[PDB]
Design a protein around this ligand. Structure first.
Ligand SMILES: Nc1nc2c(ncn2[C@@H]2O[C@H](COP(=O)(O)OP(=O)(O)OP(=O)(O)O)[C@@H](O)[C@H]2O)c(=O)[nH]1
Ligand SMILES: Nc1nc2c(ncn2[C@@H]2O[C@H](COP(=O)(O)OP(=O)(O)OP(=O)(O)O)[C@@H](O)[C@H]2O)c(=O)[nH]1
Ligand SMILES: Nc1nc2c(ncn2[C@@H]2O[C@H](COP(=O)(O)OP(=O)(O)O)[C@@H](O)[C@H]2O)c(=O)[nH]1
Ligand SMILES: [Mg+2]
Ligand SMILES: [Mg+2]
Lengths: 201, 440, 41, 78, 426, 440
């Protein structure tokens, strides 16, 4: 069971699962139909299956990276950690990545790659931000609500978690989607619906 | 910054100035009011459109274009069309009497009194620019304004600005069918005069796109709009690299450097690769090698002139979509000297490549679907020397019995201009014969 | 010598096509030979 | 009134165990106390195959044990 | 320290060594996901002889897996042992050969040789000490008999010092599976006799005998027949593989088994074979293995020892054993049937041992041997080749890739004087 | 990735490819409007279907063979049938006027005008055909389009693609039933041209399958769609080694290297073993010897001739499904005790085996039961010399009166094409008498 939000905003210590909202876009031509939720994937890795209920394989406990308290209101553009509990008695796991070299390339598209690992560093902190480019500095550092379209950005690559539904990863489960970290910008240089995310409660 | 003006001349200029500029409105976010819709998100500081669309404060994007005509029944379809609020009324120049399939009408008598106002307006659309890449001329060799006034636009433009870029995309006559009869007198006496007053060029014959549309699509009984749309699809890919980023880039100063070996030999062709219908787009999957070989095949050519008879003098490529420079450079290498493809020996490297990420955009009511790769290739050849030789054939034939000529002398015109415009193509036929000679 | 250079670029294009087959087979060799292991499971 | 190719292609167009993987845990085993023994012990066949193992010692390793037991030793020096 | 280079070709070869690298993975105790999960520190001692080390603690073999198409390297990757062979150790052409020697020897099989020659020189020179080369070629087809048997001729060009030993698949007796086999076996023999130094011979109709007469199976497969082909490779190296009493290696047996360069024509065997239900009731001791490995029906090369005479016989042993009562069993069988050797050699047997029997078993053996009734095996092919060449049958498949009839006129002159050696020793 | 660019010609090849290409849709997970239900194929699928189906950005699997005729009037039922969204709009080459049982117009006049748009499509399909070892042809000797267009191609492909394989699933005109009359002219002349250009020829005939579905199947009064699945399964067990896994996968050169010893003899047979009804199969017992020994009894052959008169000379097998390879050894071992089943002295080996895993998938709405073991023994036999001499005997009788000839001089032939296609068949009758001749 996830944690309810009294006020609209998402505190730390809340059990929250991560899902990309549904896209009205048509340029991709290959298209998982709607509301694709991120998931832990073994053969670990990381990939978003189809829309799912909170199943514990999805559920992220919103931790603290700058030494914050268990219940604390979270603002845009501030570091936090998002921790997935292991199936057995494993305490914490970390949404991780690395600056790209030749040999650490993502599966099925040679982009940045996002995976899960035990160890702790600054490559585990993420900060979420406003989608509109003209309003980021107006609303930066403001309490972020429950179920809203916000972008997920790193704090050492400044890239962003991409809903890359062009390609399909057939798994043991058969539900599919590939997730990397890459920032996309339009001909007007605005952030695409390819990169949006929503942290449901 | 990085502005580039369109100057379209004729009612062919206005039938092209609607279909081009309707693609340009939906290639960017523009509505027919002019303003992009509120709830469309743009960061504001980065403007892709600014080559073509000017800006006031309120957000209205008036194009930097002027249209030229001498009879109002073609611009009055623009002035109360769908786009009647987008185009600022000063830019759409109308005469009162048309030059009426002639040269000296629009070159000395009637077009003389309409170079006054257009020169006033191009100094009001080229003061706004910081860096003007070049103008563009979209004119038809057939009618009076497209042949007479167009060359007199050219000569005055040389005095006023010097060495700016002035490209043309010219509607050359088709070899078999035509609008009219008196068209060669207007098609050689402008070509003889627009030689020292032209930077780069292209050609199209109107019957050649008629061939492509039926043999590649099922659009039976086409229309000029179904041809004016593909002219939009080929002008957009000329300027595709100016506004949107890429792995490589092609600017407008850049065709003439790599395709004009000599400053009178500036006559490429034009070709657009993936001509394929919407119910044929889904079935056949396509690759970068697949779109290149079509531009090499003679069926896709926008002229009725096969370069199998001639030598590929130089080339230009404009790729688009999801192309890799790795597989662009593989089919380029797969094409040869020993094939039906054959190059001159004095152009050994022989290419220019430009790669744009932004995929081509589909216009409502057209024919082609959401294609994902494309080519705009502009290859010079020695084969154009047969296109002049057929128009030499049918001009001195009409000049043998000295026909239609009273319609030319008494319109403020001299006499010997026929005797030199046949002389001038005779040396330029020799000039195009020696440009392709093997090394001695 | 024109024959020498043309058939030189013939070797270069044949080598690139050969290596495209080879590399494609190894990367999607991994990708498409996982599922029959799952079916044997 | 329709052709045979269309007719046949239209006809082509118109053309449980008790212990499952969800039951393998709660169906218990080893009950009612049958007598387990070999030969004529009459139990159902128990987990008695010749299991496959490698013999860790060799001839040298067994016969050259310490002939008499002793306290091994200490580090030779500090 | 004395590593063995695993060489293959074809789709017969890769479907043979799919089981050889099962039992090395069984006996050294190797999980099919890279690591080690064994029951002692004896197997990890001499473990780099078949398994190169890397980061992650893992072990990939010296694995060369070749065919002239990706037709069968799809099946080894998705077999049971698939992620311990290397992704860079499948070398392939495009078009499969299909039943001619010439496109295996000259045009399609021969063009792709410059990636086997890379992976040998990258791997085998980087071994601290290789011991030699072991290649199994599909001798009756077009790729293994064509491309691998080319490499048999062209790595014996580079290093002549080492030992060459093959486990070849000679054509079957009564039922025959490809009409070009009295050519692609006739022509390979012309290449073998100057460029091989041990030749084992394997016949499948001689190995469907065992899973009916001996191991009592109604329905045998290839995954049943090929483990008695993994016996003749995983169980002859046992002196390198594990310590013990007496260690005699592969170079130590070619001294004792062949006396000559034109004799290397062996005839294998394997001792501890019986039914499946009667495993508890037959006692596996000294007399039983020696009673077994001398008969006709416990031998893999489809000929009869009665019609000729052996010359040499070798025998790996394993497990803790007595050496007296083994000797009086093999001194007897040199002497009770005194017809079935020649009287101008003193002895014939070689006894090597080990310490550890292969896993599951308890007291094992293996069997190598030259015999001069394998001259009957190479006469049935030369009977067939004479009844085809005179009608000039099937022949235009052979001049179409650059061969002449002088590869054909002397591939019977070689098979005449070979048997014209074994006729005196009779 | 392994491939098969198969060829179909005519009323023959499109009412065969209505039933042959039905099965490749059916044996993979291909639904009849392009896509896949994504249920995972036996083994690896992504290499199993790539002999037939390719992929685009819609998931749309579109085949790679070709259907040719000289009309629309039988291609149009494919175009207006159940499988209309699946095939490609330009993989279906049409004509306007059928060759009308002529070798004259079909090879030259109504052949040459339409051969050229085809050859774009093969060379646009053969670009991505990485593993493809030949071309597989389905034509008809006794017609106009299957014999005139087709042997126009057979003199052309061997010029272009060199030493590649050519094997034929060809519809031989039948020994007793007459569909046309003057079918010796279209059959003997095409076997004057193809005979030096092709390399193997699987031979089937209609009446000898109408025998089989009356006595093996119990169907009274069948049609072509009843007959076209038995040939349409013969094609799909021959192909079946590339596609689904097994002990013995078999390459495309194993066929034509083990069924043909000489250049001028390349005439095998065709036979397919488990031909038994859908309801009676489970009260008879399918064993591997009964499946094997059925094919040497002449009532299962698909050419009405007898091997009792002549001699077998080379053979094949391709088992499938549940096959214990010991039983294959101990079933063939009984054939080697016969003198009623005779070989010539110069093929002492004789055989070949290919083994899959898949039991044969059955079309829903068919005739055969869900069998689990099938073998098809495509095999040479020298008793087509009796069969060939009867399409030969009645030609000599007809030409003596010099009948029907005037419509063959009149479209681009001489009278000398008739004489040499009796001069060639004279030496071939002087050839099979020495191929089967014993050596003492
Ligand atoms: N290829 C092509 N040609 C066009 C198109 N639209 C108009 N034309 C050509 O334009 C010519 C018409 O003459 P114009 O020069 O445009 O007429 P004008 O500008 O009013 O000149 P005058 O008639 O002399 O007054 C004919 O040759 C048409 O073929 C077009 O969309 N594509
Ligand atoms: N049994 C059977 N016979 C067929 C089938 N298709 C065609 N045939 C035979 O093919 C012959 C028909 O002649 P066509 O194939 O139409 O002749 P063509 O080569 O197409 O030349 P044109 O008729 O001039 O276009 C007859 O003998 C038919 O029996 C089929 O699907 N099944
Ligand atoms: N014992 C055994 N024999 C095999 C196996 N696979 C193929 N063969 C034999 O090898 C022959 C096949 O030859 P092939 O590999 O196709 O020839 P290639 O084209 O030269 O590779 C047949 O006679 C088979 O009996 C196998 O796994 N085990
Ligand atoms: Mg005008
Ligand atoms: Mg027809």
């Amino acid at each position: 069971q996830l944690s309810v939000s009294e006020d609209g905003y998402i505190h730390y210590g809340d059990k929250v699962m991560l899902v990309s909202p549904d896209h009205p876009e048509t340029e991709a031509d290959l298209f998982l139909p709607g509301d694709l939720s991120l998931c832990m994937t073994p053969d670990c890795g990381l990939s978003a299956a189809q829309t799912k209920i909170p199943v514990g394989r999805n559920t992220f406990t919103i931790l603290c990276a700058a030494g914050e308290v268990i219940g604390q209101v979270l603002r845009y553009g501030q570091n936090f950690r998002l921790g997935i509990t292991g199936g057995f008695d494993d305490r914490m796991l970390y949404l991780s990545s690395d600056h790209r070299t030749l040999l650490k390339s993502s599966k099925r598209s040679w982009l940045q790659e996002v995976f899960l690992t035990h160890e702790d560093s600054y490559l585990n902190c993420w900060q979420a931000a406003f989608p509109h480019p003209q309003l980021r500095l107006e609303y930066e550092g403001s309490p972020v609500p429950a179920n809203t379209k916000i972008l997920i950005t790193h704090c050492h690559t400044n890239r962003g978690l991409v809903a890359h539904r062009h390609l399909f990863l057939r798994t043991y489960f058969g539900q599919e989607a590939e997730v990397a970290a890459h920032t996309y910008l339009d001909s007007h240089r605005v952030e695409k619906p390819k990169n949006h995310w929503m942290l449901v409660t | 910054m990085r502005e580039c003006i369109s100057v379209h001349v004729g009612q062919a200029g206005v039938q092209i100035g609607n279909a081009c500029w309707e693609l340009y409105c939906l290639e960017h976010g523009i509505q027919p009011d002019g303003q992009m819709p509120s709830d469309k998100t743009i960061g504001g500081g980065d403007d892709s459109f600014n080559t073509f669309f000017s800006e006031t404060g309120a957000g209205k994007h008036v194009p930097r274009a002027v249209f030229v005509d001498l009879e109002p029944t073609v611009i009055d379809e623009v002035r109360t069309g769908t786009y009647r609020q987008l185009f600022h009324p000063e830019q759409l120049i109308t005469g009162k009497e048309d030059a009426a399939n002639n040269y000296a009408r629009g070159h000395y008598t009637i077009g003389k009194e309409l170079i006054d106002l257009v020169l006033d307006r191009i100094r009001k659309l080229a003061d706004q620019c910081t860096g003007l890449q070049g103008f563009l001329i979209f004119h038809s060799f057939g009618g009076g304004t497209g042949s007479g006034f167009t060359s007199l636009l050219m000569e005055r433009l040389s005095v006023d600005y010097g060495k700016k870029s002035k490209l043309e995309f010219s509607i050359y006559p088709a070899p078999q069918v035509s609008t009219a009869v008196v068209e060669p007198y207007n098609s050689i006496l402008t070509t003889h005069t627009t030689l020292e007053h032209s930077d780069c060029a292209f050609m199209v014959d109107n019957e050649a796109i008629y061939d492509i549309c039926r043999r590649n699509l099922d659009i039976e009984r086409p229309t000029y709009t179904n041809l004016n749309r593909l002219i939009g699809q080929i002008v957009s890919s000329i300027t595709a690299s100016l506004r949107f980023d890429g792995a490589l880039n092609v600017d407008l100063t850049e065709f003439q450097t790599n395709l004009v070996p000599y400053p009178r030999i500036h006559f490429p062709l034009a070709t657009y690769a993936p001509v394929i219908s919407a119910e044929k787009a889904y079935h056949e999957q396509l690759s970068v090698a697949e779109i290149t070989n079509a531009c090499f095949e003679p069926a896709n050519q926008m002229v009725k002139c096969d370069p199998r008879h001639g030598k590929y003098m130089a080339c230009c490529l404009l790729y688009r979509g999801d192309v890799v420079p790795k597989d662009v450079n593989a089919a380029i290498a797969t094409i040869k000297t020993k094939r039906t493809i054959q190059f001159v020996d004095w152009c050994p490297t022989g290419f220019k490549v430009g790669i744009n990420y932004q995929p081509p955009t589909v216009v409502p009511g057209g024919d082609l679907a959401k294609v994902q790769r494309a080519v705009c290739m502009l290859s010079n050849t020695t084969a154009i020397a047969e296109a002049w030789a057929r128009l030499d054939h049918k001009f001195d034939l009409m000049y043998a019995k000295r026909a239609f000529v009273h319609w030319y002398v008494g319109e403020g015109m001299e006499e010997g201009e026929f005797s030199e415009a046949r002389e001038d193509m005779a040396a330029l036929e020799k000039d195009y014969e020696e440009v392709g000679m093997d090394s001695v | 010598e024109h024959f020498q250079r043309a058939l030189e670029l013939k070797k270069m294009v044949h080598r690139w096509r050969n290596s495209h087959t080879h590399c494609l087979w190894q990367i999607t060799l991994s990708q498409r030979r996982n599922p029959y292991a799952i079916l044997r499971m | 009134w329709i052709s045979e190719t269309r007719e046949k292609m239209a006809q082509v167009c118109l053309n449980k165990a008790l212990l499952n993987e969800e039951t393998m845990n709660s169906g218990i085993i080893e009950r009612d106390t049958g007598l387990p023994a070999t030969g004529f012990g009459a139990l159902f066949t128990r987990h008695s195959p010749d299991w496959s193992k490698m013999c860790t010692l060799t001839t040298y390793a067994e016969e050259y044990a310490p002939p008499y037991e002793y306290q091994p030793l200490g580090d030779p020096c500090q | 320290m004395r590593e063995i280079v695993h060489l293959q070709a074809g789709q017969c070869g890769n479907q043979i060594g799919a089981k050889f690298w099962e039992v090395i993975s069984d006996e050294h105790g190797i999980d099919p996901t890279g690591t080690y999960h064994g029951d002692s520190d004896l197997q990890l001692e001499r473990i780099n002889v078949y398994y190169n080390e890397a980061t992650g603690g893992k072990y990939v073999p010296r694995a060369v897996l070749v065919d002239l198409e990706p037709g069968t390297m799809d099946s080894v990757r998705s077999g049971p042992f698939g992620q311990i062979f290397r992704p860079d150790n499948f070398v392939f052409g495009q078009s499969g050969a299909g039943n001619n020697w010439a496109k295996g020897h000259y045009t399609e099989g021969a063009e792709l040789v410059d990636s086997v020659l890379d992976v040998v020189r990258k791997e085998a020179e980087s071994c601290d000490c290789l011991q030699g080369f072991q290649l199994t070629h599909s001798l009756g087809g077009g790729t293994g008999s064509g491309m691998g048997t080319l490499l048999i001729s062209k790595i014996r060009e580079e290093y002549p010092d080492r030992i060459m030993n093959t486990f070849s698949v000679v054509p079957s007796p009564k039922v025959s599976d490809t009409v070009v086999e009295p050519y692609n076996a006739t022509l390979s023999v012309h290449q073998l006799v100057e460029n091989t130094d041990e030749t084992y011979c394997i016949d499948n109709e001689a190995l469907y005998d065992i899973c009916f007469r001996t191991l009592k199976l109604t329905t045998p497969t290839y995954g049943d027949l090929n483990h008695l082909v993994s016996a003749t490779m995983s169980g002859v190296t046992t002196c390198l593989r594990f310590p013990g009493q007496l260690n005699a290696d592969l170079r130590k047996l070619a001294v004792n088994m062949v006396p000559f360069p034109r004799l290397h024509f062996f005839m294998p065997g394997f001792a501890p074979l019986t039914s499946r239900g009667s495993q508890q009731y037959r006692a596996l001791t000294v007399p039983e293995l020696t009673q077994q490995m001398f008969d006709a029906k416990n031998m893999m090369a489809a000929c009869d020892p009665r019609h000729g005479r052996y010359l040499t016989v070798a025998a790996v042993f394993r497990g803790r054993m007595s050496m007296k009562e083994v000797d009086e069993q093999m001194l007897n069988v040199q002497n009770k049937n005194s017809s079935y050797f020649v009287e101008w050699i003193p002895n014939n047997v070689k006894t090597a041992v080990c310490d550890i029997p292969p896993r599951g078993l308890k007291m094992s053996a293996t069997f190598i041997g030259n015999s001069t009734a394998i001259q009957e095996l190479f006469k049935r092919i030369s009977e067939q080749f004479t009844a085809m060449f005179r009608r000039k049958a099937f022949l235009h498949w052979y001049t179409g890739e650059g061969m002449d009839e002088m590869e054909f006129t002397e591939a019977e002159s070689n098979m005449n004087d070979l048997v014209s050696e074994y006729q005196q020793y009779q």
